[PDB]
Amino acid sequence: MGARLITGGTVYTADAQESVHARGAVLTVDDKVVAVGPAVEVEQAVQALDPAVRAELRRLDASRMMVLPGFVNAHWHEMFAMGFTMRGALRPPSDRADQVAFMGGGGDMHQISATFDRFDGLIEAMTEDEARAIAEYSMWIQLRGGVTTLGDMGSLNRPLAMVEAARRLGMRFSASTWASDAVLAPDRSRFLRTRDADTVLASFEALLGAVAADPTGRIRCRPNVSYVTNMTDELARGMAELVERHDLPFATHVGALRNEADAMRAYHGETGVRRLAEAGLVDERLMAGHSAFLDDQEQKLMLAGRAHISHSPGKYGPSGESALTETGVVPALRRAGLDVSLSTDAAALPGAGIAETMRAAWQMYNEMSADQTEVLPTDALAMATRIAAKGLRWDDAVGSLEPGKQADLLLVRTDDWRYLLNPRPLESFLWLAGSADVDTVIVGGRTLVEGGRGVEVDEAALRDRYLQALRGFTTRALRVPAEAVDPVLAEVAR
Amino acid sequence: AMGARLITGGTVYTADAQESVHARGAVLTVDDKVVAVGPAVEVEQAVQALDPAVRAELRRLDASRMMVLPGFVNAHWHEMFAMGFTMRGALRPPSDRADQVAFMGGGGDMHQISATFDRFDGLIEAMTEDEARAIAEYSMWIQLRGGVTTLGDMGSLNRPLAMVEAARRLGMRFSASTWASDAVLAPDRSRFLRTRDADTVLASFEALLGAVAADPTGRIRCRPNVSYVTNMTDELARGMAELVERHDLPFATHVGALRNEADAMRAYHGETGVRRLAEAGLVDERLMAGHSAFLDDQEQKLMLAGRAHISHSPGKYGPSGESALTETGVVPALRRAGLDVSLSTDAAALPGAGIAETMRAAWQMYNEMSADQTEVLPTDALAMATRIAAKGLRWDDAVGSLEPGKQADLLLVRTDDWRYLLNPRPLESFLWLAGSADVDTVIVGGRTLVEGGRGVEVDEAALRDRYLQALRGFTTRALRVPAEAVDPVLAEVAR
Numbered sequence: 001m002g003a004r005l006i007t008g009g010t011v012y013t014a015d016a017q018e019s020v021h022a023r024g025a026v027l028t029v030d031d032k033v034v035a036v037g038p039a040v041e042v043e044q045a046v047q048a049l050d051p052a053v054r055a056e057l058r059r060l061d062a063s064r065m066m067v068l069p070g071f072v073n074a075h076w077h078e079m080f081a082m083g084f085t086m087r088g089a090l091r092p093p094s095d096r097a098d099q100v101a102f103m104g105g106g107g108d109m110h111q112i113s114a115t116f117d118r119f120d121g122l123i124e125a126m127t128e129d130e131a132r133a134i135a136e137y138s139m140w141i142q143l144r145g146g147v148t149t150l151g152d153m154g155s156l157n158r159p160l161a162m163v164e165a166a167r168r169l170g171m172r173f174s175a176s177t178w179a180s181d182a183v184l185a186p187d188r189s190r191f192l193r194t195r196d197a198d199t200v201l202a203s204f205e206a207l208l209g210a211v212a213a214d215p216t217g218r219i220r221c222r223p224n225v226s227y228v229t230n231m232t233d234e235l236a237r238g239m240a241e242l243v244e245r246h247d248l249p250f251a252t253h254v255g256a257l258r259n260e261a262d263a264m265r266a267y268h269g270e271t272g273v274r275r276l277a278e279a280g281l282v283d284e285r286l287m288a289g290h291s292a293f294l295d296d297q298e299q300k301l302m303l304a305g306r307a308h309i310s311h312s313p314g315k316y317g318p319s320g321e322s323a324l325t326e327t328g329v330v331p332a333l334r335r336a337g338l339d340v341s342l343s344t345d346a347a348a349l350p351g352a353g354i355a356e357t358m359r360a361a362w363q364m365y366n367e368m369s370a371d372q373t374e375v376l377p378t379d380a381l382a383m384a385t386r387i388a389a390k391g392l393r394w395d396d397a398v399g400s401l402e403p404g405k406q407a408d409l410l411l412v413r414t415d416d417w418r419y420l421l422n423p424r425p426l427e428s429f430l431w432l433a434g435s436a437d438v439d440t441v442i443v444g445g446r447t448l449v450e451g452g453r454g455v456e457v458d459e460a461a462l463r464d465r466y467l468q469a470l471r472g473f474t475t476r477a478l479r480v481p482a483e484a485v486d487p488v489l490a491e492v493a494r
Numbered sequence: 495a496m497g498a499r500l501i502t503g504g505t506v507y508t509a510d511a512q513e514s515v516h517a518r519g520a521v522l523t524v525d526d527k528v529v530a531v532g533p534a535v536e537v538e539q540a541v542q543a544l545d546p547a548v549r550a551e552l553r554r555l556d557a558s559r560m561m562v563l564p565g566f567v568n569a570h571w572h573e574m575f576a577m578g579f580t581m582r583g584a585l586r587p588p589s590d591r592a593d594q595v596a597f598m599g600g601g602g603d604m605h606q607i608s609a610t611f612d613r614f615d616g617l618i619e620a621m622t623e624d625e626a627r628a629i630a631e632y633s634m635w636i637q638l639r640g641g642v643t644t645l646g647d648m649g650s651l652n653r654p655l656a657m658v659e660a661a662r663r664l665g666m667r668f669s670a671s672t673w674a675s676d677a678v679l680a681p682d683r684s685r686f687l688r689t690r691d692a693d694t695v696l697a698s699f700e701a702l703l704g705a706v707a708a709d710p711t712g713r714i715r716c717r718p719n720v721s722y723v724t725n726m727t728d729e730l731a732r733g734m735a736e737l738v739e740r741h742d743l744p745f746a747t748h749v750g751a752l753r754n755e756a757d758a759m760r761a762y763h764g765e766t767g768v769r770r771l772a773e774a775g776l777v778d779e780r781l782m783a784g785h786s787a788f789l790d791d792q793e794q795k796l797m798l799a800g801r802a803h804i805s806h807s808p809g810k811y812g813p814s815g816e817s818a819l820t821e822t823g824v825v826p827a828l829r830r831a832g833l834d835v836s837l838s839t840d841a842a843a844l845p846g847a848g849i850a851e852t853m854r855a856a857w858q859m860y861n862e863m864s865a866d867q868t869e870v871l872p873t874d875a876l877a878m879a880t881r882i883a884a885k886g887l888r889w890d891d892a893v894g895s896l897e898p899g900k901q902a903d904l905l906l907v908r909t910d911d912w913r914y915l916l917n918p919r920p921l922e923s924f925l926w927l928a929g930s931a932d933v934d935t936v937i938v939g940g941r942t943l944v945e946g947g948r949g950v951e952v953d954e955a956a957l958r959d960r961y962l963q964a965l966r967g968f969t970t971r972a973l974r975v976p977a978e979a980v981d982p983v984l985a986e987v988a989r
């Protein structure tokens with residue numbers, strides 16, 4: 001790949017000092033950052049290279065650009081196979097008849113639990129070709145929005161199809177498997193066990209074996225539990241044993257909804273964080289999704305364990321979640337020194353990206369505390385890069401522009417009205433820009449997106465295979481009639 | 495401009511009384527008015543019913559790869575681009591690490607807010623007529639570029655007639671105002687100073703009203719504001735009540751905006767802001783109250799009983815350190831109780847959240863606080879930025895919805911990229927993943943002003959460069975910022 005100097009822009013590093021450099025530069029050799037700082041300081045690193053390396057150095061003039069570390073979306077679900085349902089493409093254009101459903105109104109816990117237990121049967125119904133075409137397009141949308149490292153916390157897709165998608169696209173991916181072995185059946189006053197814990201844990205072991213073979217360093221894996229509602233004691237302890245043995249991170253959704261604690265006490269006899277604590281899962285390895293509905297003891301367990309919270313303040317309103325303001329626990333735990341990162345959660349059609357989530361945190365944390373300094377723009381960036389990489393246990397290699405780390409970075413144009421005269425283009429980016437304003441995406445020194453276009457992939461072809469795969473999956477497996485699907489596909493703007 | 499236009503095939507959001515949405519809908523316009531709106535095939539019947547002369551010169555715009563919205567009505571805005579080259583804007587270090595809670599943050603520094611607002615008159619006088627017009631036209635262009643077709647001044651650091659001229663040149667609609675402060679809180683004196691004759695402040699608004707009446711385009715109205723209830727004597731409040739009754743006008747102010755406001759109002763004026771307004775007879779259907787979140791039960795009941803209007807800016811509270819959404823939850827609660835609530839951008843000295851960003855904010859933030867994805871539907875957020883804002887501005891006679899007899903003010907947004915694919919609700923995708931810059935076409939009174947994201951009736955490079963020269967002149971001569979601090983920033987501008 002050789003050496004490149006990216007010079008002249010404002011450079012955000014998201015290093016320990018959250019360093020920003022006006023007229024900064026980044027020097028990369030092959031897959032790694034070697035120098036980053038003021039342009040003159042970096043130019044000295046250039047004149048210190050082996051003369052052979054310096055001979056083929058490529059200069060990128062970024063003087064009309066902002067440079068960011070690649071986004072690390074550590075809490076994501078591939079759900080594009082469900083695009084053609086009454087959460088997506090089949091809805092009437094009018095939203096007036098919409099109802100509080102699913103996650104809304106505190107959470108319909110029976111429906112959420114029953115829904116999650118059905119994923120295994122639908123993943124099974126999917127062809128490898130459908131899986132790969134849907135995964136590839138879904139993951140392209142993440143990449144297009146500046147996500148260079150993506151974290152699977154449970155997808156309706158085939159794990160090895162998602163690994164193949166990451167490999168073809170050139171991005172980094174923490175692969176997972178679906179884990180559900182319990183359901184909250186309304187005809188019972190105790191959890192119904194739905195699967196052998198050993199089978200669920202064997203699926204993840206098989207994925208871990210396959211990713212171990214990968215030589216690129218771009219593929220890792222992390223076991224998840226779908227949701228603590230759908231987790232037996234045997235699955236929780238099996239997960240604790242598996243992450244200790246293989247030295248892995250661990251992720252689940254816990255304290256996510258108002259109605260969760262009550263359903264957890266009724267069906268399992270104990271709240272989410274306490275059941276994880278009893279299995280030994282509340283430690284530095286834990287990424288807890290949402291994690292807002294925590295009492296005093298559960299908050300103290302997370303803080304003592306130096307656990308990690310992934311927060312999705314961009315997504316809550318449209319799902320009817322209340323995981324920011326109803327408790328205010330996640331901002332309080334961040335203030336008390338808990339690691340808190342920003343993530344986009346699940347989407348069956350494109351929803352808020354990392355850029356949109358960064359804006360949401362900036363506006364929403366600061367409004368609740370009447371304090372424009374609680375989340376600075378650089379904090380929002382750190383929360384979407386270095387701090388997310390830490391929660392994913394990938395901060396050895398990604399999440400900041402420092403010497404020795406991977407050359408994963410974004411260029412954003414700053415030459416329009418939105419940015420004019422602002423010495424803080426990241427602030428203009430949070431006010432008035434988002435995912436589609438990502439211009440260039442580089443992963444380990446390779447240009448994957450440029451001018452907001454795929455460089456080595458045909459996004460028109462990725463789209464057409466996705467639509468073909470989605471048609472097959474939607475008509476066959478979801479039994480949606482062709483009369484509802486084919487008209488919508490016919491009016492897709494080619 | 496004159497002539498007939500059929501905009502057909504896109505998804506059309508009307509923001510009419512039913513919040514109607516038409517997939518493969520159409521808008522037929524003749525001269526400056528909407529004549530028909532609905533399903534393509536039904537509008538095509540209205541086309542076949544036109545005078546053959548009119549039909550002959552019809553221009554058909556294929557909008558099949560677009561979303562059609564009403565023009566955004568930003569009814570609560572301040573022109574502050576003259577202050578771009580201060581420590582709120584261009585002179586800040588790139589690093590944010592040393593930023594402090596200031597001004598409206600931490601519940602509000604009421605003395606500094608009051609003192610700052612009372613200095614506007616002096617700084618406006620320090621501005622050349624050319625600087626005023628150049629900064630106004632660039633500031634107002636930034637609004638228009640993001641889809642704002644009707645803009646409401648609620649008190650600006652600019653010359654009113656410069657802003658009227660800017661609106662006139664740009665082709666957009668403008669509710670002009672004057673700056674109105676006749677009191678300052680002076681902690682050193684244990685009282686408010688009465689800094690101006692209420693009757694002179696009112697006579698300045700009467701003179702603006704005379705000048706706007708001479709504008710023949712129908713695009714310029716005016717509305718008196720009070721800067722802030724801290725800076726308002728009883729005599730200014732009563733004079734405002736008399737003026738808006740005599741001329742049948744709307745009225746606007748900031749009230750119940752900050753945690754520390756109520757204590758400062760009781761100490762300096764005896765009474766909280768909504769109570770002082772109600773005593774002057776200003777809490778009625780004419781009132782647009784900016785922020786209006788720190789209200790007790792009696793104040794909330796006064797607003798409801800008067801059918802007053804609240805303009806909310808949930809896009810910009812966090813970055814200002816304001817807490818006018820969650821600390822009280824009063825504005826969402828008043829909306830649920832039937833008060834008209836609209837969405838606005840407020841003040842910016844450099845580009846900040848536009849209407850499109852504020853719609854997203856309302857959709858996320860109101861729905862999260864109530865654990866309810868239906869409290870603010872995407873079509874509600876649109877209504878709050880169009881029809882409801884028009885109603886609060888008293889311009890809903892002509893703007894805010896795509897209905898027959900209203901002005902042909904509309905936006906086209908392209909829906910053909912990845913963000914919109916397969917979504918029968920392109921407005922939802924727009925709130926998820928788009929913003930001000932994704933406005934493609936802006937039509938006001940049937941005239942295209944923006945197309946493909948570019949101004950077609952202005953020189954965008956001229957608006958920018960004249961704004962930069964004006965700001966240099968104002969910054970160095972009036973604000974006394976040295977050339978040595980200004981020219982390096984201006985030298986870095988990407989031309």
Ligand SMILES: O=C(O)c1cccc(OC(=O)c2cccc(O)c2)c1
Pocket residue numbers: 077079103154155226227253256257290321345346347
């Ligand atoms: O909505 C989906 O399709 C979906 C798919 C996979 C995982 C998923 O998980 C949560 O987001 C989640 C899970 C529990 C509580 C909560 O408040 C959010 C959701």
Ligand SMILES: O=C(O)c1cccc(OC(=O)c2cccc(O)c2)c1
Pocket residue numbers: 572574598649650721722748751752785816840841842
């Ligand atoms: O910030 C500015 O430059 C500015 C300029 C003109 C008016 C203005 O007014 C408010 O938005 C305002 C006024 C009072 C309380 C509040 O919470 C907000 C602010």
Ligand SMILES: [Zn+2]
Pocket residue numbers: 075076077153253289345346
């Ligand atoms: Zn999730």
Ligand SMILES: [Zn+2]
Pocket residue numbers: 570571572648748784840841
């Ligand atoms: Zn204001």
